Structure 1
């Protein structure tokens, strides 16, 4: 019966020409006799071109293709938290099947103008440089762009681990469920990442979608949309989600493979004409909703890898045109030990300023201004600018897998911007920072608790801070 069932005519180049399937819809999931799945791409007068989600080795000429009647969708819900799935929603962690009750199409259009509201509440990364200078809000699209091995995945992982302090509490408003989409990475890297999230107890609120380097190009193309659907579930049911696409460069390369194998006209760098639409329709789905639509959000942290620091290339500029700002990571800084190697003159957050808390604003306006002066200078005043800027740049450094609470960042930046560190020599800034942070955590949980509950620094808290920092700097090496 050639109306719900077809036979493969040709296979190769990742596309299977199927004869029959007369009632198949465009963009519908089909199921091959081998157990593989595909998507109806080209409905033609005499055949159906099917994008195979897997290896062409498993599909032969003459194989039976049945249609599932459903436009391509993935399982969504709370039942995916803690699971590692592939681009189709099948669990690859061996913990059994996903018990999901709801499915959601992967190519749903982003919300319109009316369902949205401005980004107002903060998405805390726990990274001092980000949380202070490039603040991210819930519903934003912030790009993490840089060369290879500059610390991009580390920023994303620190954010995910940071969300634990909110996901363990009772404030349901302030929770954030994370989705990590691995696209074209090494499988061992994703396994080690999932272990890092399991040690930090960050997997219980994280979904990992894995389309690695050995997976077929259609799977690496589909993975970001599957992850985005899993996040749109939370965004549309009143909750808040964060999604990392690591990275969209390899997804664009997978899509270019698929497009060149379909014999479509290449453009700049042999990329198809719709490589911008590929990322735009995806990153538009990260939105902050107004309260008549639940009030939830979906934050996107796409990752892009540049070649020799070239950020004016085709795909980098496309994504810069799509997102709400970018966090540049430089190799020249990363080699010099400044880590996270965030370029502060080039990174920006267009809509995150309205999300920064009041305390962090109080310290970060001054920090940002002093850093701008230190940049614009590099006698007896410019020397003070240089000294303050150097102290601040050592204050911005941070370690891996240890994100900080917002009040601790506020305390450290406070010590930095009022001028207490001008006494120490730059090589001692990190020593002072760690010792002082441990001191304030141990014996001053009341001031930190007050700053955290108040969201700002009152003159009472400002006085207590000045007292504590003067005493510590007095009794310090």
Structure 2
């Protein structure tokens, strides 16, 4: 029973035809008596066999590709993820209740395109380009390929620009870059949204100072966040003015899976325009684990094989090209940048969680935020001994860069002696002093939620604990003494260090005197 027996079956060997003359006469009246029960034969269009829950299986469509936007007959847009032998599995953007067995499926032909450009600065769309902010359609914009591969090796250059976050917990302890992929991995309800929003409001109030060529515009991608939190952050962006230089793509949890699956992909499609035309771009892929759950929903309805934690095989490749298209280009294409903030919530402390081991290996630096450190007063609750970066020097403030080695290594011994407090030793004026130093370092490095403080105030604020000026101050009231260190010094010295950029001896003489001129209220 082989195919040559099938090709032998293509040769007719009937030896008689005492039916074919009559069945060809009663064929046409048969198909035209029951003509109303015939849907027309459909070739370059499509029609639905099976539909449900966001995955609709469509017969025909000889013309489609993988990743072609399709349009159902009710106006619903779709996407062809896989193409089987006789049918095409179509993923459905949005609610799918309107599609029946027998409805028409129209190919739009293009790869899925979400509108890009600078006219979107101030608009909140979903992952599909439709506005939800109530300000009408997008003007002075254009479509672009969201499925584009990353810039190649010859296209990139070495990163130089430090990307100040406005947070002393970040900029002194973890060196970030402008083309560096920085991961914020923590628990749930631990300040991950806090660290990302601290970077943008800093990048807005440092956007009205820098001259056109370090101006980092931001896109904040909301995946699965509830719509009150989306109105919360829009209210936060508007009431400081940051919405002028902020785009936000906001896939809620009450939307379908592929609108959440595409929303970081469309989120980087906006920000590649800011990289292509020479500017700098900020991107935050918030709740990137919940985008991967939005990937897991589509495949497990799509009869695709599961793997670790029932996630599919290629989920490393999902997060790979989602975080490889952010870069720092060479001189030959404007010199634009993209810096990446993925957010991965651990399952209450699984660093070996399946999504975590992918995204900790893709990204360049990570910031651990345990729920332990969040209740010891350390806010934002950065883990210091577990957080690494790549590029190190020429990725911080250069005056901060010299004093950071005096900050990191003294913090390195202090994390070893903090758990050795079970005996009451305080021996030889070192096992007490490194406890006396690093505890005030922890009480140094706390701050407030939504308080963007520039680096030039922090390079002074890092100098207060590295030198003296705090060798007689308690562990209780540094959080109200640091601001008097900020206030009572001359407010012109912060501008000239940010003008300088490095700790010269020409400026070092002023910075030792002015911190004894201030008097600390910790007593």
TM-score range, shorter chain: over 0.9
User: What aligned pairs does 1:173-192 form with structure 2 within 5 A after superposition?
Assistant: 173-192=213-232
Measured after TM superposition, the shift of residue 167 of structure 1 is 1.7
* Corresponding residue to 1:453 among 496, 499, 508: 499
Indicate yes or no: 2:518 matched with 1:469. no
Greater alpha carbon shift after TM alignment, 97-106 vs 461-470 = 97-106
* Corresponding residue to 1:288 among 315, 323, 328: 328
Indicate yes or no: 2:64 matched with 1:15. no
CA distance in 2 between partners of 1:216 and 1:327 (Å): 30
Measured after TM superposition, the shift of residue 81 of structure 1 is 0.9
Measured after TM superposition, the shift of residue 3 of structure 1 is 5.0
Q: Give the RMSD, CA atoms, in angstroms.
A: 1.5
Spell out, residue by residue over 1:83-106, the C-alpha distance to the aligned partner (whole angstroms, 9 max, x if none).
111011111010111114321111
Indicate yes or no: 2:471 matched with 1:422. yes
Measured after TM superposition, the shift of residue 352 of structure 1 is 4.8
- Whether the aligned pair in 2 keeps the contact of 1:154 and 1:400 (CA below 8 Å) is yes
Indicate yes or no: 2:296 matched with 1:253. no
Greater alpha carbon shift after TM alignment, 13-22 vs 449-458 = 13-22
Match of 1:55 in 2: 95
- Whether the aligned pair in 2 keeps the contact of 1:132 and 1:364 (CA below 8 Å) is yes
User: What aligned pairs does 1:211-222 form with structure 2 within 5 A after superposition?
Assistant: 211-222=251-262
Indicate yes or no: 2:157 matched with 1:117. yes
User: What aligned pairs does 1:266-415 form with structure 2 within 5 A after superposition?
Assistant: 266-378=306-418, 379=427, 380-415=429-464
- Whether the aligned pair in 2 keeps the contact of 1:166 and 1:176 (CA below 8 Å) is no
Indicate yes or no: 2:265 matched with 1:225. yes
* Corresponding residue to 2:168 among 111, 119, 128: 128
Measured after TM superposition, the shift of residue 474 of structure 1 is 6.7
- Whether the aligned pair in 2 keeps the contact of 1:38 and 1:53 (CA below 8 Å) is yes
- Whether the aligned pair in 2 keeps the contact of 1:240 and 1:298 (CA below 8 Å) is yes
- Whether the aligned pair in 1 keeps the contact of 2:366 and 2:388 (CA below 8 Å) is yes
Say which SS state the counterpart of residue 206 (structure 2) adopts.
helix
CA distance in 1 between partners of 2:363 and 2:226 (Å): 26
User: Scaled by the length of structure 2, what TM-score is found?
Assistant: 0.88
Q: 1:152 to 1:474 in 2, by over 3 A?
A: closer
- Whether the aligned pair in 2 keeps the contact of 1:420 and 1:473 (CA below 8 Å) is no
CA distance in 2 between partners of 1:172 and 1:190 (Å): 29
Measured after TM superposition, the shift of residue 170 of structure 1 is 5.0
Say which SS state the counterpart of residue 80 (structure 1) adopts.
coil
CA distance in 1 between partners of 2:255 and 2:321 (Å): 23
Measured after TM superposition, the shift of residue 166 of structure 1 is 2.7
CA distance in 1 between partners of 2:522 and 2:510 (Å): 18
Q: 1:309 to 1:159 in 2, by over 3 A?
A: same
CA distance in 1 between partners of 2:45 and 2:333 (Å): 40
CA distance in 2 between partners of 1:476 and 1:332 (Å): 27
- Whether the aligned pair in 2 keeps the contact of 1:235 and 1:298 (CA below 8 Å) is yes
CA distance in 1 between partners of 2:83 and 2:156 (Å): 35
Measured after TM superposition, the shift of residue 117 of structure 1 is 1.1
- Whether the aligned pair in 1 keeps the contact of 2:474 and 2:522 (CA below 8 Å) is no
User: Scaled by the length of structure 1, what TM-score is found?
Assistant: 0.96
- Whether the aligned pair in 2 keeps the contact of 1:388 and 1:419 (CA below 8 Å) is no
- Whether the aligned pair in 1 keeps the contact of 2:69 and 2:108 (CA below 8 Å) is yes
Match of 2:14 in 1: none
CA distance in 1 between partners of 2:410 and 2:389 (Å): 18
Measured after TM superposition, the shift of residue 373 of structure 1 is 1.9
State the structure with more CA Rg: 2
Say which SS state the counterpart of residue 137 (structure 1) adopts.
coil
Spell out, residue by residue over 1:91-141, the C-alpha distance to the aligned partner (whole angstroms, 9 max, x if none).
101011111432111111011111011211111111101010102110111
Question: By percentage of residues, which structure has more helix?
Answer: 1
Match of 1:83 in 2: 123
Q: How many residues in Structure 1 have an aligned counterpart in Structure 2? A: 474
Measured after TM superposition, the shift of residue 13 of structure 1 is 4.2
CA distance in 2 between partners of 1:102 and 1:223 (Å): 17
CA distance in 2 between partners of 1:38 and 1:430 (Å): 53
Measured after TM superposition, the shift of residue 6 of structure 1 is 2.0
Greater alpha carbon shift after TM alignment, 75-84 vs 258-267 = 258-267
